[PDB]
Amino acid sequence: ESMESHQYQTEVTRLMDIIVNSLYTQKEVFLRELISNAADALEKIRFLSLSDESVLGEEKKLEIRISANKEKNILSITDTGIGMTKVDLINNLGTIAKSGTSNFLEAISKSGGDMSLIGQFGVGFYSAFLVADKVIVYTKNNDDEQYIWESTADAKFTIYKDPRGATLKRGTRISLHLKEDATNLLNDKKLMDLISKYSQFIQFPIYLLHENVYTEEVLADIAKDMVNDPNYDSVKVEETDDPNKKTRTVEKKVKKWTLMN
Ligand SMILES: CCNC(=O)c1cc2c(-c3cc(OCCN(CC)CC)c(Cl)cc3Cl)nc(N)nc2s1
């Protein structure tokens, strides 16, 4: 059941209308905003770890992880930053609702200005709706349990405890359920370009999960047993009609993490 106020639904509908009509040709900028949010959250927990190192108890990693799921049409930006308690999340939503950021952006757009301040105005998250019709946020902060915040393009949201528990240990995962028009964002070449572009001044490692293909010649009888290997996402054995051939070219596809900065 939706938990938005009419004020939240109005403010966010205005933000979305302005952001969309102002950035319809630069849809890709959502990634700059999400990476920016993630670095800010990582800086918060990094700063606290200087006085009390025990804050990193649940997860020593301090990084950003980008991964696409081509079958489910989902893009995820995950970080091991501070994360949010239910209190931090509802405060953040109340901040968005009470502020008149849409007044500032309406003014910027009417004046012929750009959306380069959406990040400084703390509304950069809503740029995700340029490419997605549904955004599912999973978050975990040391002081609370893991929560799920599920938002839609109609400015409606719902918050509930994660049935699977603290799968994140510490940090936040932004899962974008992409629109049919945003398929290009699941490709390794596009993501690599976008991440190299938007990582310029990010003091934390950014990792991309991309396809690695392994090719070798194998004896036909073993080529059939290669298919079963669970260490690979998929195994493609070459199809041959000639019973002459005693060997088969085998392509083993699997995704590994590469440091992008
Ligand atoms: C312990 C406190 N932790 C937090 O507050 C965290 C937030 C976030 C956000 C994040 C930040 C957002 O807005 C930034 C501006 N707000 C706060 C000034 C005012 C609305 C939004 Cl609209 C959405 C998300 Cl998901 N993103 C990420 N990856 N991590 C965190 S950890």
mmCIF file of C-alpha atoms and ligand atoms in Angstrom:
data_model
loop_
_atom_site.group_PDB
_atom_site.id
_atom_site.type_symbol
_atom_site.label_atom_id
_atom_site.label_comp_id
_atom_site.label_asym_id
_atom_site.label_seq_id
_atom_site.Cartn_x
_atom_site.Cartn_y
_atom_site.Cartn_z
ATOM 1 C CA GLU A 1 0.000 0.000 0.000
ATOM 2 C CA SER A 2 1.314 3.489 -1.147
ATOM 3 C CA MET A 3 2.646 5.719 1.717
ATOM 4 C CA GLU A 4 3.133 9.101 -0.081
ATOM 5 C CA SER A 5 1.612 12.387 1.072
ATOM 6 C CA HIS A 6 -0.287 14.546 -1.485
ATOM 7 C CA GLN A 7 2.588 17.115 -0.953
ATOM 8 C CA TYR A 8 5.218 14.415 -1.818
ATOM 9 C CA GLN A 9 3.127 13.301 -4.844
ATOM 10 C CA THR A 10 2.849 16.923 -6.065
ATOM 11 C CA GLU A 11 6.524 17.984 -5.483
ATOM 12 C CA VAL A 12 7.997 14.758 -7.063
ATOM 13 C CA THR A 13 5.478 14.921 -10.025
ATOM 14 C CA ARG A 14 6.664 18.502 -10.704
ATOM 15 C CA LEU A 15 10.367 17.453 -10.301
ATOM 16 C CA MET A 16 9.835 14.536 -12.745
ATOM 17 C CA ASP A 17 7.947 16.727 -15.302
ATOM 18 C CA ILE A 18 10.715 19.408 -15.266
ATOM 19 C CA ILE A 19 13.714 16.937 -15.168
ATOM 20 C CA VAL A 20 12.190 14.813 -18.013
ATOM 21 C CA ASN A 21 11.334 17.745 -20.382
ATOM 22 C CA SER A 22 14.772 19.319 -19.601
ATOM 23 C CA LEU A 23 16.955 16.178 -19.900
ATOM 24 C CA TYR A 24 15.000 14.001 -22.467
ATOM 25 C CA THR A 25 18.094 14.283 -24.773
ATOM 26 C CA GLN A 26 20.704 13.691 -21.978
ATOM 27 C CA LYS A 27 18.969 10.688 -20.279
ATOM 28 C CA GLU A 28 22.382 9.145 -19.374
ATOM 29 C CA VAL A 29 23.121 11.835 -16.676
ATOM 30 C CA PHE A 30 21.132 9.762 -14.079
ATOM 31 C CA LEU A 31 24.324 7.672 -13.671
ATOM 32 C CA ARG A 32 26.394 10.766 -12.785
ATOM 33 C CA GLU A 33 23.760 11.557 -10.062
ATOM 34 C CA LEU A 34 23.606 8.018 -8.578
ATOM 35 C CA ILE A 35 27.460 7.684 -8.508
ATOM 36 C CA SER A 36 27.496 11.144 -6.812
ATOM 37 C CA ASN A 37 24.980 10.002 -4.132
ATOM 38 C CA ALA A 38 27.011 6.809 -3.560
ATOM 39 C CA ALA A 39 30.367 8.699 -3.117
ATOM 40 C CA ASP A 40 28.634 11.076 -0.596
ATOM 41 C CA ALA A 41 27.315 8.074 1.417
ATOM 42 C CA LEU A 42 30.817 6.390 1.275
ATOM 43 C CA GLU A 43 32.458 9.624 2.456
ATOM 44 C CA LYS A 44 30.058 9.733 5.490
ATOM 45 C CA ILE A 45 30.964 6.214 6.714
ATOM 46 C CA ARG A 46 34.699 6.770 5.750
ATOM 47 C CA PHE A 47 34.763 9.954 7.886
ATOM 48 C CA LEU A 48 33.278 8.133 10.942
ATOM 49 C CA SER A 49 35.782 5.219 10.506
ATOM 50 C CA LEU A 50 38.672 7.676 11.236
ATOM 51 C CA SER A 51 37.518 8.160 14.896
ATOM 52 C CA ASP A 52 35.985 4.637 15.449
ATOM 53 C CA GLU A 53 37.121 1.922 12.991
ATOM 54 C CA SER A 54 34.404 -0.457 14.397
ATOM 55 C CA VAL A 55 31.749 1.304 12.156
ATOM 56 C CA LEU A 56 33.143 -0.800 9.205
ATOM 57 C CA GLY A 57 32.456 -4.006 11.208
ATOM 58 C CA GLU A 58 29.737 -5.362 8.902
ATOM 59 C CA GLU A 59 31.744 -4.614 5.630
ATOM 60 C CA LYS A 60 35.413 -3.439 5.243
ATOM 61 C CA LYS A 61 34.884 -2.650 1.493
ATOM 62 C CA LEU A 62 34.420 1.049 0.592
ATOM 63 C CA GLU A 63 33.357 1.093 -3.110
ATOM 64 C CA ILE A 64 30.685 1.424 -5.832
ATOM 65 C CA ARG A 65 29.456 -1.604 -7.890
ATOM 66 C CA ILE A 66 27.521 -1.245 -11.184
ATOM 67 C CA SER A 67 25.835 -4.339 -12.698
ATOM 68 C CA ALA A 68 23.140 -4.999 -15.307
ATOM 69 C CA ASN A 69 20.739 -7.931 -15.554
ATOM 70 C CA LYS A 70 19.828 -8.193 -19.262
ATOM 71 C CA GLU A 71 17.100 -10.873 -18.705
ATOM 72 C CA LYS A 72 15.177 -8.929 -15.989
ATOM 73 C CA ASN A 73 16.028 -5.489 -17.667
ATOM 74 C CA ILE A 74 17.490 -4.089 -14.392
ATOM 75 C CA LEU A 75 20.522 -1.831 -13.770
ATOM 76 C CA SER A 76 21.946 -1.652 -10.208
ATOM 77 C CA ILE A 77 24.275 0.832 -8.498
ATOM 78 C CA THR A 78 25.417 -0.566 -5.150
ATOM 79 C CA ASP A 79 27.610 1.050 -2.515
ATOM 80 C CA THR A 80 29.060 0.088 0.862
ATOM 81 C CA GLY A 81 28.356 3.579 2.235
ATOM 82 C CA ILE A 82 26.542 4.697 5.413
ATOM 83 C CA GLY A 83 23.097 3.435 4.181
ATOM 84 C CA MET A 84 19.728 4.523 5.612
ATOM 85 C CA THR A 85 17.628 3.660 8.684
ATOM 86 C CA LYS A 86 13.806 3.903 8.215
ATOM 87 C CA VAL A 87 14.119 7.271 10.120
ATOM 88 C CA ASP A 88 16.813 8.597 7.681
ATOM 89 C CA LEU A 89 14.666 7.471 4.712
ATOM 90 C CA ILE A 90 11.370 9.099 5.888
ATOM 91 C CA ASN A 91 13.322 12.284 6.877
ATOM 92 C CA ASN A 92 14.874 12.362 3.369
ATOM 93 C CA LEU A 93 11.405 11.904 1.791
ATOM 94 C CA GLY A 94 9.949 14.633 4.062
ATOM 95 C CA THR A 95 12.851 16.939 3.091
ATOM 96 C CA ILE A 96 12.055 16.402 -0.627
ATOM 97 C CA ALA A 97 8.284 17.041 0.012
ATOM 98 C CA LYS A 98 8.673 20.159 2.261
ATOM 99 C CA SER A 99 11.336 21.879 0.054
ATOM 100 C CA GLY A 100 10.236 23.834 -3.001
ATOM 101 C CA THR A 101 13.010 22.496 -5.299
ATOM 102 C CA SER A 102 10.442 22.282 -8.154
ATOM 103 C CA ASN A 103 10.068 26.116 -7.803
ATOM 104 C CA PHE A 104 13.859 26.512 -8.297
ATOM 105 C CA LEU A 105 13.931 24.058 -11.272
ATOM 106 C CA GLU A 106 10.759 25.560 -12.882
ATOM 107 C CA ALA A 107 12.539 28.969 -12.589
ATOM 108 C CA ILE A 108 15.803 27.566 -14.054
ATOM 109 C CA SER A 109 13.892 25.986 -17.002
ATOM 110 C CA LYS A 110 11.720 29.100 -17.656
ATOM 111 C CA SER A 111 15.002 31.153 -17.767
ATOM 112 C CA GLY A 112 16.618 28.747 -20.271
ATOM 113 C CA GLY A 113 19.085 27.307 -17.732
ATOM 114 C CA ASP A 114 20.401 23.709 -17.398
ATOM 115 C CA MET A 115 19.661 20.910 -14.867
ATOM 116 C CA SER A 116 23.338 20.909 -13.644
ATOM 117 C CA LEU A 117 22.147 21.837 -10.091
ATOM 118 C CA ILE A 118 19.747 18.870 -9.482
ATOM 119 C CA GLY A 119 22.625 17.229 -7.552
ATOM 120 C CA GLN A 120 23.364 20.360 -5.449
ATOM 121 C CA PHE A 121 19.594 20.658 -4.737
ATOM 122 C CA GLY A 122 19.645 17.057 -3.397
ATOM 123 C CA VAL A 123 17.068 15.836 -5.995
ATOM 124 C CA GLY A 124 19.533 14.085 -8.402
ATOM 125 C CA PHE A 125 17.999 10.698 -7.469
ATOM 126 C CA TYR A 126 14.760 11.484 -9.437
ATOM 127 C CA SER A 127 16.756 11.629 -12.729
ATOM 128 C CA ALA A 128 16.609 7.759 -12.553
ATOM 129 C CA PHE A 129 12.956 8.180 -13.801
ATOM 130 C CA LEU A 130 14.433 9.508 -17.126
ATOM 131 C CA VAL A 131 15.327 5.822 -17.928
ATOM 132 C CA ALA A 132 13.153 3.785 -15.446
ATOM 133 C CA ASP A 133 9.408 3.591 -14.646
ATOM 134 C CA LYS A 134 10.148 1.805 -11.274
ATOM 135 C CA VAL A 135 13.137 2.215 -8.886
ATOM 136 C CA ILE A 136 13.665 -0.227 -5.994
ATOM 137 C CA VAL A 137 16.053 0.962 -3.292
ATOM 138 C CA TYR A 138 17.506 -1.573 -0.742
ATOM 139 C CA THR A 139 19.363 0.039 2.191
ATOM 140 C CA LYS A 140 21.118 -1.016 5.426
ATOM 141 C CA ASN A 141 22.623 1.239 8.124
ATOM 142 C CA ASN A 142 24.410 -0.137 11.252
ATOM 143 C CA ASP A 143 21.669 1.308 13.589
ATOM 144 C CA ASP A 144 18.687 -0.392 11.818
ATOM 145 C CA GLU A 145 17.494 -3.383 9.746
ATOM 146 C CA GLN A 146 17.511 -3.598 5.908
ATOM 147 C CA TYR A 147 14.610 -1.724 4.262
ATOM 148 C CA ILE A 148 13.122 -1.618 0.754
ATOM 149 C CA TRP A 149 11.830 1.677 -0.783
ATOM 150 C CA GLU A 150 9.885 1.039 -3.985
ATOM 151 C CA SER A 151 9.008 4.148 -6.087
ATOM 152 C CA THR A 152 7.111 4.598 -9.391
ATOM 153 C CA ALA A 153 6.907 7.323 -12.142
ATOM 154 C CA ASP A 154 3.410 8.385 -10.814
ATOM 155 C CA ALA A 155 5.254 9.703 -7.625
ATOM 156 C CA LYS A 156 3.879 6.832 -5.443
ATOM 157 C CA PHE A 157 6.121 4.847 -3.039
ATOM 158 C CA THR A 158 6.069 2.052 -0.415
ATOM 159 C CA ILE A 159 8.547 1.190 2.417
ATOM 160 C CA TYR A 160 8.896 -2.257 4.099
ATOM 161 C CA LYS A 161 11.528 -4.455 5.839
ATOM 162 C CA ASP A 162 13.539 -6.684 3.486
ATOM 163 C CA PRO A 163 12.175 -10.293 3.798
ATOM 164 C CA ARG A 164 15.735 -11.607 2.951
ATOM 165 C CA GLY A 165 17.354 -9.688 5.887
ATOM 166 C CA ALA A 166 20.672 -7.730 5.784
ATOM 167 C CA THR A 167 21.884 -9.065 2.366
ATOM 168 C CA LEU A 168 23.779 -5.724 1.935
ATOM 169 C CA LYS A 169 25.728 -5.923 5.299
ATOM 170 C CA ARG A 170 26.053 -2.039 5.052
ATOM 171 C CA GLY A 171 25.214 0.341 2.200
ATOM 172 C CA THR A 172 22.595 0.976 -0.513
ATOM 173 C CA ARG A 173 21.524 -0.661 -3.815
ATOM 174 C CA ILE A 174 19.522 1.352 -6.383
ATOM 175 C CA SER A 175 17.779 -1.051 -8.763
ATOM 176 C CA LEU A 176 16.369 0.603 -11.865
ATOM 177 C CA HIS A 177 13.668 -1.350 -13.707
ATOM 178 C CA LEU A 178 14.448 0.201 -17.118
ATOM 179 C CA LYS A 179 11.917 1.345 -19.705
ATOM 180 C CA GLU A 180 11.776 -0.554 -23.077
ATOM 181 C CA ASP A 181 13.483 2.595 -24.584
ATOM 182 C CA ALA A 182 16.587 2.286 -22.265
ATOM 183 C CA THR A 183 17.954 -1.225 -23.342
ATOM 184 C CA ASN A 184 21.370 0.357 -24.413
ATOM 185 C CA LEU A 185 22.190 0.901 -20.683
ATOM 186 C CA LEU A 186 22.568 -2.843 -20.092
ATOM 187 C CA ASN A 187 25.527 -3.000 -22.576
ATOM 188 C CA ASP A 188 29.155 -3.195 -21.368
ATOM 189 C CA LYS A 189 30.403 -0.681 -24.026
ATOM 190 C CA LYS A 190 27.834 2.027 -22.983
ATOM 191 C CA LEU A 191 28.358 1.479 -19.219
ATOM 192 C CA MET A 192 32.181 1.629 -19.587
ATOM 193 C CA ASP A 193 31.916 4.886 -21.554
ATOM 194 C CA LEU A 194 29.421 6.428 -18.991
ATOM 195 C CA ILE A 195 31.437 5.313 -15.917
ATOM 196 C CA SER A 196 34.808 6.591 -17.338
ATOM 197 C CA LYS A 197 32.983 9.892 -18.129
ATOM 198 C CA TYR A 198 31.252 10.326 -14.711
ATOM 199 C CA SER A 199 34.084 9.068 -12.379
ATOM 200 C CA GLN A 200 36.548 12.012 -12.895
ATOM 201 C CA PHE A 201 36.470 13.267 -9.251
ATOM 202 C CA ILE A 202 35.325 10.106 -7.279
ATOM 203 C CA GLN A 203 37.725 9.211 -4.379
ATOM 204 C CA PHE A 204 36.385 5.592 -4.193
ATOM 205 C CA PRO A 205 36.767 2.538 -6.476
ATOM 206 C CA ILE A 206 33.979 1.964 -9.040
ATOM 207 C CA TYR A 207 33.591 -1.657 -10.279
ATOM 208 C CA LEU A 208 31.660 -2.816 -13.362
ATOM 209 C CA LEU A 209 30.409 -6.433 -13.757
ATOM 210 C CA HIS A 210 30.902 -7.284 -17.457
ATOM 211 C CA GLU A 211 31.006 -10.348 -19.780
ATOM 212 C CA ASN A 212 34.320 -12.256 -20.188
ATOM 213 C CA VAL A 213 34.414 -14.939 -22.921
ATOM 214 C CA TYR A 214 36.828 -17.942 -22.615
ATOM 215 C CA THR A 215 37.501 -19.930 -25.837
ATOM 216 C CA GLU A 216 39.281 -23.326 -26.233
ATOM 217 C CA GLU A 217 39.238 -26.526 -28.352
ATOM 218 C CA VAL A 218 37.876 -29.546 -26.518
ATOM 219 C CA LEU A 219 37.278 -33.231 -27.424
ATOM 220 C CA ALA A 220 33.620 -33.674 -28.494
ATOM 221 C CA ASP A 221 32.846 -36.165 -25.654
ATOM 222 C CA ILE A 222 34.189 -33.676 -23.015
ATOM 223 C CA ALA A 223 32.573 -30.695 -24.892
ATOM 224 C CA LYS A 224 29.153 -32.162 -23.904
ATOM 225 C CA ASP A 225 30.292 -32.325 -20.206
ATOM 226 C CA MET A 226 31.558 -28.656 -20.374
ATOM 227 C CA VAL A 227 27.909 -27.421 -20.611
ATOM 228 C CA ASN A 228 27.354 -28.571 -17.010
ATOM 229 C CA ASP A 229 30.198 -26.433 -15.466
ATOM 230 C CA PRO A 230 28.424 -24.157 -12.869
ATOM 231 C CA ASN A 231 31.483 -21.809 -12.730
ATOM 232 C CA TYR A 232 30.196 -20.275 -15.997
ATOM 233 C CA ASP A 233 26.949 -18.403 -16.708
ATOM 234 C CA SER A 234 26.639 -20.252 -20.029
ATOM 235 C CA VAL A 235 28.702 -22.578 -22.222
ATOM 236 C CA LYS A 236 28.268 -22.535 -26.024
ATOM 237 C CA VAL A 237 29.615 -25.732 -27.750
ATOM 238 C CA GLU A 238 29.943 -25.425 -31.588
ATOM 239 C CA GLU A 239 27.217 -27.291 -33.564
ATOM 240 C CA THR A 240 28.668 -29.678 -36.187
ATOM 241 C CA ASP A 241 26.884 -32.157 -38.512
ATOM 242 C CA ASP A 242 30.149 -33.861 -39.695
ATOM 243 C CA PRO A 243 30.874 -36.937 -37.480
ATOM 244 C CA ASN A 244 34.397 -36.482 -38.938
ATOM 245 C CA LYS A 245 35.251 -33.786 -36.259
ATOM 246 C CA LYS A 246 36.534 -35.249 -32.938
ATOM 247 C CA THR A 247 37.011 -31.735 -31.393
ATOM 248 C CA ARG A 248 34.628 -28.770 -30.735
ATOM 249 C CA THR A 249 35.293 -25.019 -30.133
ATOM 250 C CA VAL A 250 33.736 -24.145 -26.765
ATOM 251 C CA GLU A 251 32.844 -20.571 -25.678
ATOM 252 C CA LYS A 252 32.516 -20.236 -21.857
ATOM 253 C CA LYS A 253 30.749 -16.917 -20.957
ATOM 254 C CA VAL A 254 30.985 -15.481 -17.406
ATOM 255 C CA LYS A 255 30.830 -12.023 -15.773
ATOM 256 C CA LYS A 256 33.701 -10.696 -13.595
ATOM 257 C CA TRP A 257 34.317 -7.343 -11.784
ATOM 258 C CA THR A 258 36.678 -4.805 -13.373
ATOM 259 C CA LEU A 259 37.968 -1.601 -11.630
ATOM 260 C CA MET A 260 36.920 1.341 -13.792
ATOM 261 C CA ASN A 261 39.012 4.100 -12.068
HETATM 262 C C1 LIG B 1 22.664 7.809 7.454
HETATM 263 C C2 LIG B 1 22.089 8.848 6.490
HETATM 264 N N1 LIG B 1 22.117 8.341 5.111
HETATM 265 C C3 LIG B 1 21.445 8.900 4.099
HETATM 266 O O1 LIG B 1 20.747 9.912 4.183
HETATM 267 C C4 LIG B 1 21.669 8.221 2.747
HETATM 268 C C5 LIG B 1 21.127 8.607 1.579
HETATM 269 C C6 LIG B 1 21.565 7.927 0.492
HETATM 270 C C7 LIG B 1 21.208 8.049 -0.863
HETATM 271 C C8 LIG B 1 20.158 8.902 -1.282
HETATM 272 C C9 LIG B 1 20.203 10.296 -1.082
HETATM 273 C C10 LIG B 1 19.122 11.112 -1.478
HETATM 274 O O2 LIG B 1 19.088 12.477 -1.363
HETATM 275 C C11 LIG B 1 20.231 13.191 -0.876
HETATM 276 C C12 LIG B 1 19.678 14.504 -0.301
HETATM 277 N N2 LIG B 1 18.932 14.174 0.932
HETATM 278 C C13 LIG B 1 19.771 14.123 2.142
HETATM 279 C C14 LIG B 1 20.518 15.447 2.327
HETATM 280 C C15 LIG B 1 17.773 15.052 1.096
HETATM 281 C C16 LIG B 1 16.571 14.367 0.441
HETATM 282 C C17 LIG B 1 17.997 10.536 -2.073
HETATM 283 CL CL1 LIG B 1 16.669 11.525 -2.601
HETATM 284 C C18 LIG B 1 17.956 9.166 -2.290
HETATM 285 C C19 LIG B 1 19.006 8.349 -1.872
HETATM 286 CL CL2 LIG B 1 18.822 6.645 -2.120
HETATM 287 N N3 LIG B 1 21.829 7.256 -1.769
HETATM 288 C C20 LIG B 1 22.808 6.388 -1.406
HETATM 289 N N4 LIG B 1 23.396 5.598 -2.290
HETATM 290 N N5 LIG B 1 23.152 6.233 -0.122
HETATM 291 C C21 LIG B 1 22.556 6.971 0.819
HETATM 292 S S1 LIG B 1 22.815 7.023 2.480
#
